[PDB]
Design a protein around this ligand. Structure first.
Ligand code: HEM
Ligand code: HEM
Lengths: 134, 146
């Protein structure tokens, strides 16, 4: 089980910072309220900040796929940041997860099968649950 | 929800590039695979026992086409989605007892499938307009519950 979500993540390019950046761009454009968490970011289309943040998000999720047996432990610091410090409303994690699925499907539809879609949705929801906890 | 003239023209142009049969089957099939409780509503459709069975089920595909045809009606009445979907809202509430949260899920699966189908053409801008469309349809369908 933990190998297969791990396999699927790589096969749809989940490692790629550029896809993290595109997911953020999609989220900011479709759901403008999410921008209020990033007032320090230049939002100009080719934003260096969005590119760098896309890599942070992709890298964190890629690390997490190696730790499906204990996500709360793997994501401890990130949970503190998002839940305690930033107080991100849980609705926003559902928006970013959806935009990540949209992005991965966009570039690698052949690898983004219904089964892979289901697995990755569960993975991203699981990460979201941990990040929304205290 | 309000779409501008340019947003409307854009969603119209893009929908025209879409294979509706493929997108309908893909959308309803993925709904049933990704959110398996939704299978409860479709018992009469037969074998849904695996992802491959769901995606190969002809009744799922035919039903998906009917759902896409309803989105098509919506695109022609974006200024009055509530009126357009009034009978369908009654059906899903009073007869089928579908919790309205599932209307949002189906809309977002449709967005994932349009992305899957269209690739680069389904831009972040295109997606923004389509999110307004599927939100509008979900809201219109949820109205009898209110
Ligand atoms: C699975 C979902 C997410 C993951 C994996 C994730 C990952 C990360 C990472 C790795 C960082 C950098 C941490 C550091 O530098 O120590 C970060 C920071 C941040 N995240 Fe998230 N994030 C997620 C969801 C969200 C959402 C939905 C929002 C708000 C809409 C959000 C808002 C922020 C903000 C405002 C920062 C601070 C960044 C900065 O100041 O440059 N995150 N996140
Ligand atoms: C945007 C969202 C939706 C739209 C536009 C839509 C549209 C439709 C349409 C056009 C029909 C056909 C009615 C007829 O042929 O007279 C139908 C039937 C039906 N819908 Fe939906 N639907 C949506 C969401 C859902 C969801 C989320 C579920 C369940 C999870 C659902 C469950 C059903 C069921 C069980 C039927 C009857 C199927 C049969 O027995 O043939 N619908 N819907």
């Amino acid at each position: 089980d933990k190998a297969n979500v791990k396999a699927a993540w790589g096969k749809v390019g989940g490692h790629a910072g550029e896809y993290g950046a595109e997911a953020l761009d999609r989220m900011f454009l479709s759901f403008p309220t999410t921008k209020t968490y990033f007032p320090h970011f230049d939002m100009s289309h080719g934003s260096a900040q969005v590119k760098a943040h896309g890599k942070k998000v992709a890298d964190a999720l890629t690390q997490a796929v190696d730790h499906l047996d204990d996500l709360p432990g793997a994501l401890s610091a990130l949970s503190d940041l998002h839940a305690h410090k930033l107080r991100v409303d849980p609705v926003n994690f559902k928006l970013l997860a959806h935009c990540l699925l949209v992005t991965l499907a966009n570039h690698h539809p052949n690898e983004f099968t219904p089964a892979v879609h289901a697995s990755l949705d569960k993975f991203l929801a699981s990460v979201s649950t941990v990040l929304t906890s205290k | 929800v309000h779409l501008s003239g340019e947003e409307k023209a854009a969603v119209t142009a893009l929908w025209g590039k879409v294979n509706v049969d493929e997108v309908g089957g893909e959308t309803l099939g993925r709904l049933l695979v990704v959110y398996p409780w939704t299978q409860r509503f479709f018992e009469t459709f037969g074998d849904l026992s695996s992802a491959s069975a769901v995606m190969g089920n002809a009744k799922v595909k035919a039903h998906g086409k009917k759902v896409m045809n309803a989105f098509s009606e919506g695109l022609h009445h974006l200024d009055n989605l509530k009126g357009t979907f009034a009978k369908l809202s009654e059906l899903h509430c009073d007869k089928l007892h579908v919790d309205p949260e599932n209307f949002k899920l189906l809309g977002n699966v449709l967005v994932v499938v349009l992305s899957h189908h269209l690739g680069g053409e389904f831009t972040p801008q295109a997606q923004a307009a389509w999110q307004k469309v599927v939100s509008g349809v979900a809201n219109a369908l949820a109205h009898k519950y209110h």
